[PDB]
From a paper:
Latency-associated nuclear antigen (LANA) mediates γ2-herpesvirus genome persistence and regulates transcription. LANA mediates persistence of episomal DNA and thus is required for long-term maintenance of viral genomes in dividing cells, a role central to viral latency. The ORF73 from MHV-68 encodes a much smaller, 314 amino acid, 50 kDa nuclear protein (termed mLANA thereafter) which lacks the extensive internal acidic and glutamine-rich repeat region of kLANA. The C-terminal region of mLANA, comprising amino acid residues 140 to 263, has amino acid similarity to the kLANA DNA-binding domain.
The structure of the C-terminal domain of mLANA was determined at 2.2 Å resolution. The crystallized domain contained residues 140–272, designated mLANA140–272. The tertiary structure of mLANA140–272 exhibits an α+β ferredoxin-like fold which assembles to form a dimeric eight-stranded anti-parallel β-barrel that is central to its functional architecture. Each monomer contributes an anti-parallel 4-stranded β-sheet “half-barrel” from which helix α2 and α3 pack onto the plaited sheet with their axis parallel to the strands of the sheet. Size exclusion analysis confirms that mLANA140–272 is also a dimer in solution. In total, seven phosphates ions were located at the surface of mLANA. Five of these are situated on the ventral face while the remaining two cap the dorsal side of helix α1. Therefore, we consider the ventral face as the putative DNA binding site of mLANA. Electrostatic surface analysis of the mLANA protein reveals an extensive positive patch on the dorsal side which includes residues Arg-156, Lys-224, 225, 228, 229, 231, 251, 253, and Arg-232. The positive electrostatic surface also encompasses the identified 226QAKKLK231 motif that is involved in binding to BET proteins.
Author numbering:
A (entry chain B): 142 to 260
B (entry chain A): 141 to 261
The structure:
């Protein structure tokens, strides 16, 4: 399921997507991927998983009062070790999506001191 | 309504931040991730940490970290605010309350470059 994207990522970024090896000690960064199409983000939730990248399920952003949004913007977070890895993850995922999922946007995110995942 | 207590607390403690009227900021550059293994508590925070200047997501789950000793899902939500100042304030207020009434809750300052992908008015 999503073999296509999975294999693409494993090839384009073998280290980041090595399903084998050891998680980083802390996840200081992430990429928020957002889109009005939850089905697409769900594809990403399935594909963007490894030892070095952990992704939340798809959820929703809150509506901003005083705008006329016609549609919920969904999102997920993909946690990675640091800023280097986040830049890379965003680059690779979006190169793909640019052709096959243009509804998808990515935003670099950072936590102090790091995201609250166990050690 | 429900959680009237926590709501009133937040608005008295930080009036501008939790003013239910006014104008949202133009961009939300920061947020606080509030997390906990208790989803019911985070549902409370979800209905409560809302205003014109603070917007919170529904409760979701963090992914499990391979090869660790928890076997307990950790839930979270994000509360978006204008910037680092407002995030520091929001975290302080919410956690002063929770420190007494919800010791399971943690707060983490988060920042987005250039800002979080919420629309603009």
């Amino acid at each position: 399921k999503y073999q296509g994207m999975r294999r693409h990522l494993q090839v384009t970024a073998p280290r980041l997507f090595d399903p084998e090896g050891h998680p980083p000690t802390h996840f200081k960064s992430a990429v928020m991927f957002s889109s009005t199409h939850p089905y697409t983000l769900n594809k990403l939730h399935k594909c963007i998983q490894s030892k070095h990248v952990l992704s939340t399920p798809v959820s929703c952003l809150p509506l901003v009062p005083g705008t006329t949004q016609q549609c919920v913007t969904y999102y997920l977070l993909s946690f990675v070790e640091d800023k280097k890895q986040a830049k890379k993850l965003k680059r690779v995922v979006l190169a793909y999506c640019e052709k096959y999922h243009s509804s998808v946007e990515g935003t670099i995110v950072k936590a102090k001191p790091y995201f609250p995942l166990p050690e």
